[PDB]
Amino acid sequence: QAIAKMRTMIEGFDDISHGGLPIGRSTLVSGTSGTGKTLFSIQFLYNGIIEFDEPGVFVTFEETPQDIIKNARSFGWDLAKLVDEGKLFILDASPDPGFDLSALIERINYAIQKYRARRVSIDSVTSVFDASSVVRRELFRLVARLKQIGATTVMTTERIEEYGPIARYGVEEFVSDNVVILRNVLEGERRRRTLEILKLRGTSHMKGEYPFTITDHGINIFPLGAMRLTQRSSNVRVSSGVVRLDEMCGGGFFKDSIILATGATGTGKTLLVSRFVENACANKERAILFAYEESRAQLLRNAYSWGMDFEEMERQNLLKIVCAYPESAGLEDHLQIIKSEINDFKPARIAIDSLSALARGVSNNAFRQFVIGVTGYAKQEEITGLFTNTSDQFMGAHSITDSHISTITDTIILLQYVEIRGEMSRAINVFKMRGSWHDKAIREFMISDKGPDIKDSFRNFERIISGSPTRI
Amino acid sequence: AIAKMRTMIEGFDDISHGGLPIGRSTLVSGTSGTGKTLFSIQFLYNGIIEFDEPGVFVTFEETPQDIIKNARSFGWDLAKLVDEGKLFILDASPDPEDLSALIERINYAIQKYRARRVSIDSVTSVFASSVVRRELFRLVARLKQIGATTVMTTERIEEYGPIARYGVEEFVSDNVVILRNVLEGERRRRTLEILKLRGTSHMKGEYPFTITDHGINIFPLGAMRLTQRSSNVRVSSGVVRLDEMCGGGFFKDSIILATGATGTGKTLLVSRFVENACANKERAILFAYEESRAQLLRNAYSWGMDFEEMERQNLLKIVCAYPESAGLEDHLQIIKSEINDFKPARIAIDSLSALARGVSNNAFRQFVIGVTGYAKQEEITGLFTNTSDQFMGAHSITDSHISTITDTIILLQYVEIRGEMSRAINVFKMRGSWHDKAIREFMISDKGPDIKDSFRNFERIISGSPTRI
Amino acid sequence: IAKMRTMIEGFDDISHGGLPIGRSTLVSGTSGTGKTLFSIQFLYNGIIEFDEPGVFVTFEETPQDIIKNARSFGWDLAKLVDEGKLFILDASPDPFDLSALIERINYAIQKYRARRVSIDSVTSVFQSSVVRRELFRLVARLKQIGATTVMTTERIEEYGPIARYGVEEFVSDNVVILRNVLEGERRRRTLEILKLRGTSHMKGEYPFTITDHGINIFPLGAMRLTQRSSNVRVSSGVVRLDEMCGGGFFKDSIILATGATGTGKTLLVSRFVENACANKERAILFAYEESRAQLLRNAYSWGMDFEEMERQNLLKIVCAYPESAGLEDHLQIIKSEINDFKPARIAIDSLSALARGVSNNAFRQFVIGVTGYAKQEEITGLFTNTSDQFMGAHSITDSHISTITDTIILLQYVEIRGEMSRAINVFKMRGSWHDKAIREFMISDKGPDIKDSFRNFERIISGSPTRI
C-alpha cells in the first residue's frame, strides 16, 4: 500500500501533509528560535492521546518537566493530568545544574515499550550535539533505532538563519525521511510565520510556504492553495439599503456574492457600507463592519448624521463594529481575526472598510492572498461581503483597483467625481454584476442628512469618465 | 558519436539527446527532497520493465525494505522484481549496534545479475576534498572498467551554490544533472538541468518538471518543435453574428484570445464557445481560475444554457482551481493531464490574466507558449480569456504582450454613450481569414450577446469616451 | 611577443594573433564550460593546419575516452596518434611526482618534436602557499623546454575567484576564463582573455557556442569588416511599396517592418520572400511565431504557393521558439543556415519575438550581429517587429534598434467611421527619396492594395484621427 500517515489534528497541517506524518518514521521540524517547534511537538502528542487514544513520549533535553506542563496550561492543555493518567510520559534528559546515544535509546525504548506509545517528540536533538559526520551518524543511529520500534517521531532541530541551511549542521536534512521548516520571516518591521513541508519520502505533500498564527488554540495554518473552487451559488437577492441601487442591480445584490465599492476619497464608500449594514439589522440579521480607517466613535457620529443609529443595532446584538489599524498586525493575523470574529457572531453580512487600508505597505501578492482568503471564506460560508476600495488618484483613474482584484469580485459599484459648472458632483455606476441585468447608466447622486439620493444620468455630456466632461 | 541508453523518464531522453551515455557514471546532485532517489529508482525500474536491462541499487542510509515501500507510492512493485531476479538492492547502510570492499561487492553483484544499470545513493554519506575526489574517482573509474552505466546521487546545501557538497564530484563524473527546487516567493519550482555531457550534445539550461503518481515528468519548453498541423476547417464561436464577423467562424486549428476590461462579456463568450461544442456532440474542458462550479453553472443558466445537462452527457468537464493553489509547472501538467483523459475537441482557459498574477512575465510566457503549443499540436481549438488592467483607454491588447502567440483576437470594450456604459466587440485580427473590421455595439440579455451596428457617427471609439460627429 | 594561431573561430581575433609563443595560458572555468574541448582543439588545429605536433597530458580522463569524446566533433585523434603527430600522455593514478611529470613531458616534446602542449587539469594533481610554488615550477620548466602550453583549471563559482586557490592566475603569463552563466533558465557561454603579459588583446567577455564544429566564438566588436554597399534595387513584392520607396529596397540594406499585431508584417514578409523566388533567387524565412503549416496556409490564402517554392529549392522556412535556445545559439543557427543555402534574402519574423525575456543589451548585441553578417555578406534582410501598443505607439521599436535599420515600413491601425482600417508608411529610407504620405492599405485574398492618403484627417499617428 501507499505510505500510511497519522493525523496531527493541527489546524491546516494534515491538509498540507496530505493526511499527517508518515507512521513509524521520524519527521524533522526545524526553525529559528520562537518559530513554534516545541508547540508543534506538544500539540502533535496531545491530540493523539485526547482524540485517538495514542499514548505519547516527550523527550526534553533542557526544559524542566514543570515548565513543559506550565507552558501547556497557557493553551488550555493540562499535561500534568495525562502524566497522572499514564498516557503522556515526559522523559527529562536535561542535565542537573557519552551516555547519550546507546544509553538514551535504551531509556526512550524502556518508556516507548512501557506505555504502548505510538508517538514520540524529541526537542531539541541539536542541543545533545560534535563535528560534521558526528551529528550525521549519531542522529542516523537514533532515526534507524526508532524505525525498528515502529514508532512515529517529531524531531525539533534549531536554525541560525531564516533562509540558510535547513538544520544546524547541513546533515540532519538528509538523515530524516520527512522535513518541515518553520520560519518567522521579518517582512519590513512585521513577522510572517510560515510552515513548509520540504519532503515526505514515499508520499505526496503540498509544496511551498503556508502562513499560520500561534493563537491561544495553538498552531492555525491556512492552506492558501487548499481552499476549493467548490462553494454554493443561489439566486437569492438582498437589499443594499439603497432602493435606487437595488433597482440598478436588477432587484438588489445576490446573497452569495462579493461586492466592491471603488472611488476617490470622500465619494461615499463608507455611506454605502453603513447603509449595507443597516439593511441587515432592519430585517433581523447579524452584520459585522470591519473598519480599518475610522473609530467606532467616528463611525457612529457620521452614521447618525446620515439618519441611521448604529447604537440600537449594536444593543439589539445585530451589528458588531470591530476597528483595527492595518499596521497593528500582519495580513495572516488580520485574516485570523476576521475568520475568528465571523464564527463567534455568525452574521449574514460582512463589510470591510477598507481593503485599500490593508494593501498599504504589504506586497501585491501578499495582499491578493489575503483577499482570495477573505473573499473565498465569505463565499463558501454563504455570507454577503461588501469591500470598500479607495483609488490612489481622485480623477483620470483608468484601472478600477490599483491591486488588480476586479476579477475576484462578482459585483463592482463605481463612485467617481464629475466636474460640471466649476463644482464637484458625484456619479454612482453599477460597473458589473455576475448574474443580474443591472442598469448601464452613470447616474449623478447627492448625499444629505437622509443618505444617498441617486438622480438621473449625464445624457448631455461626453467623457463623463474623464472627470471633466464637456456638454454635448 | 557516444552511444546513449534511453531512461524512459518523460522529457529526459529529449533533453539528453537520447539518454545517459553508456559505460559512464552520471552525477545527479540536488538539495534535500529534489527527486535524486526518485530519478535513480526510475532509471533502474524503467530500464528493467522496458529493455529487460537488469540493475543494482546501492543504499547507504535508506533500508532496502523502504526503497521497495516508497516505490509502491508510484504504483511499481520493486519486491516482484527482486524475486524475478531483474533488480538487486545491495544494502550498504550502517548498523545501529571499505572503499575496495564495496567495489568488489558492486563488481560481484553486476556479473551475479548480468546488470547493465547501477544507482549509488548517495556517495556522500560514505564520507577533506583531497580525499573525497580520490575515492570518488576510484569508484567511478572502477565502474567504467566493469562497463556499467551508473547514476550517482550527491547532496547540496544551496540551490545556486556548489553543484555538489565538496566542489570535486562534478569534475570526476563525465555527466552532471542538477535537480533544483527554487523558492519562487512562497511557491517552489522544480527544474532539471544537464550541466555537461562529455563527448556528446544535449539541451542547455533549466527545464521544469513535476513529481507525480507516474514519477518525474519534465516539459522541455525548447524541443516542442513548432512543427504542428494546420487546416481551413471552421468551428462555430457559439454566436452566429461573431462567426459572420470572423468570415465563417473560428478556424479549428487555432488559439483564440478574448481580451477586455472586467465584465465586458469574456466569460460569456467562453460559455457560448463550450456549449456549441456540446451542441455538435464534441467534448470540451473549461479551466476556471476565478469563478466556481456553482457560480459558473448559475451565471450560464441566466444566459439560457444548461451546463448541468452537458456534464451529465459527459460532453463538458469543468476543472475549477485557484491560480495560487500551485506553481505554473503544476497547472500545465493538470491542464495537459485533463486533456489526455477526456480527449476534447475544444479547450477554454478563463482566464490567462488570473494565472499571470504574482509571476515573472517569463514564467507566464513560457507557460502560455506551453498550453498554446500543446493544444496547437493536438489539433484543439483554444479560447483563452484575458482581463485588461485598464477598464477604459487600454493602449495594449494584453499587458503580458502574448498577442503574437495567438492567431485570432476578439476585443471587447466599454463605450460611454450619453451617460451610459455601452459595450462593443471587434474581431481585432484573424490569421487565415477575412474578418469584419467594425467596432460593433452589443448588449447582453437572458438570451446572451446581441451584436448590433458600428458607431458610424462617432470619433475616438477606442478611447472608451468617444465624441459625436 | 610572437603568437601561435589557435585557428579556434574568432579566438585569434580576441587574442590579437593567438597565444604568446613559448608560454603557458591558463583556461579556468566551472564544469561543462569547454576547457578540455578548448585544449584538445588547440592541439588538433595545431596539427591539421600547420603540422605542429602536440602533447596532451591527462590526469583523469583515460586516453581511450579522450579519443572517443573527440570523435563527436568529426576529428579522428587515433589516426593522428598512429601517425605520431599527437601524443596522449596518461598521468592518471591507478584505479618527485611534479618532476617525474616534467621529465615525461620533456621526453615527448623532444621525442615527437612537439610545438604545443595541453595539460588538463593541473588542479586535479594537487590535494594554498604550496600550490603556488609547484605550479610556478611546472610553468617555469615549460618556458625552459620552450613549449607554448594550454593549462586547464577548475572553478567552484561562476563570477567568484578566477581559479580554485586564488593563485593560478598570478603565476600564469596569460589568463583566459570560460563562463557558463545562467540567464534566468537559459545558459550563456562567454570567453574572456583576462590578461596577456607583454601584449594587447580584446578586453571583457565574448559569447561562444560549442557546436559539432567545436568552439565558435563571435568577437561582437572586431566586426564591421568594411562591408560593401551599392545602389542596386530589389523589388519588395508589392508594386506601390516599390514606388513609395523610389524603385524598391536597396540590395545591401536592413528593412524593418514595425506595427501592431495583425497589421500585416508577415504578409509584407511573405511577398518579399516570394519576389526573390519569382526571380529564381534563394531566400530563407526565419519564423519565431508561426509553424510552417500555418505560414503555408495563410500564404496560400494571400495567393502565393510557399509549397511550390520549397520544392524548387529557392525558399527555405526555419521555425523555432525563441525560448528553445539563447541569443548566441540563435545567431549561430542563422549564421549556419545562410552558409548552407547562400540566400539572396533572409526574412526574420520577428525580431520582437527574440527580444522576449532577454536584456535589451543582450538583445541589441544579437541584432548588431545578425545585421552586420547580412550586410557584409550582401544578404538583404527584412525584419518584422510587432509593437507593444496597437494604438498610440510613440516609439518605432520598444527595443530602441531603429538606428540599426536603413529602411522602416511603419504599418498602423487608423480608427475611421466606427471601423479598424490600416495604414502603410515608408517612415525612412537612407539612400532613397521615398513617399512621405501615410497611405491606407486593405488586405484581400489577392494580397495588399495601397489606396490613397488620409489628407482630409488630423491626428492619424495617434490611431484615433479627426475629420476636418
Ligand SMILES: Nc1ncnc2c1ncn2[C@@H]1O[C@H](COP(=O)(O)OP(=O)(O)OP(=O)(O)O)[C@@H](O)[C@H]1O
Ligand atoms: N498562549 C499563547 N498565546 C499566544 N502566543 C503564545 C502562547 N503560548 C506561546 N505563544 C508563542 O508561541 C511561540 C511558540 O514557540 P515554541 O515555544 O514552540 O518555541 P520553539 O519554536 O521550540 O523555539 P525554542 O527553540 O526557542 O524553544 C512562543 O515563542 C510564544 O511567543
Ligand SMILES: Nc1ncnc2c1ncn2[C@@H]1O[C@H](COP(=O)(O)OP(=O)(O)OP(=O)(O)O)[C@@H](O)[C@H]1O
Ligand atoms: N451630514 C452630511 N450631509 C451631507 N453630506 C455629508 C454629510 N456627512 C458626510 N457627507 C458627505 O459624505 C462624505 C463622506 O465620505 P464617505 O465616508 O461617505 O465616503 P468614503 O469614500 O468612504 O470616504 P473616505 O475615502 O474619506 O474614507 C463627505 O465628503 C461629504 O460630502
Ligand SMILES: Nc1ncnc2c1ncn2[C@@H]1O[C@H](COP(=O)(O)OP(=O)(O)OP(=O)(O)O)[C@@H](O)[C@H]1O
Ligand atoms: N507518490 C508521490 N507523489 C508525489 N510526490 C511524491 C510522491 N512520492 C514522493 N514525492 C515527492 O518526492 C520528494 C522526495 O523525493 P526523493 O526521495 O527522491 O528526494 P531526494 O532529493 O532524494 O531527497 P534526499 O536525498 O534528501 O533523501 C518529496 O518532496 C515528495 O513530495
Ligand SMILES: Nc1ncnc2c1ncn2[C@@H]1O[C@H](COP(=O)(O)OP(=O)(O)OP(=O)(O)O)[C@@H](O)[C@H]1O
Ligand atoms: N442575465 C443578464 N442580463 C443582462 N445582462 C447580463 C446578464 N448576465 C450578465 N449580464 C451582463 O454581462 C456581464 C457578464 O460578463 P462576464 O460574466 O462574461 O464577465 P467577464 O467579461 O468575463 O469579466 P470578469 O472576468 O471581470 O468577470 C455582466 O457583468 C452584466 O453586465
Ligand SMILES: Nc1ncnc2c1ncn2[C@@H]1O[C@H](COP(=O)(O)OP(=O)(O)OP(=O)(O)O)[C@@H](O)[C@H]1O
Ligand atoms: N558534439 C557536441 N555538440 C555540442 N555540444 C557538445 C558536443 N560535445 C560536447 N559538447 C558540450 O561541450 C562541453 C564539452 O565538455 P568539456 O569536457 O570540454 O568541458 P570541461 O569544462 O572541460 O569539463 P570538466 O572540467 O567538468 O571536465 C559539454 O558541456 C558538452 O555538453
Ligand SMILES: Nc1ncnc2c1ncn2[C@@H]1O[C@H](COP(=O)(O)OP(=O)(O)OP(=O)(O)O)[C@@H](O)[C@H]1O
Ligand atoms: N484571406 C484574407 N483576406 C483578407 N484579409 C486577410 C486574409 N488573411 C489574412 N488577412 C488579414 O491579415 C491580417 C494578418 O496579417 P499578418 O499575419 O501579416 O499579421 P502581422 O502584422 O504579422 O501580425 P502578427 O504577427 O502580430 O499576427 C489579419 O488581421 C487579417 O485581417
Ligand SMILES: [Mg+2]
Ligand atoms: Mg523548545
Ligand SMILES: [Mg+2]
Ligand atoms: Mg471611509
Ligand SMILES: [Mg+2]
Ligand atoms: Mg534520497
Ligand SMILES: [Mg+2]
Ligand atoms: Mg469573467
Ligand SMILES: [Mg+2]
Ligand atoms: Mg574537462
Ligand SMILES: [Mg+2]
Ligand atoms: Mg507576424
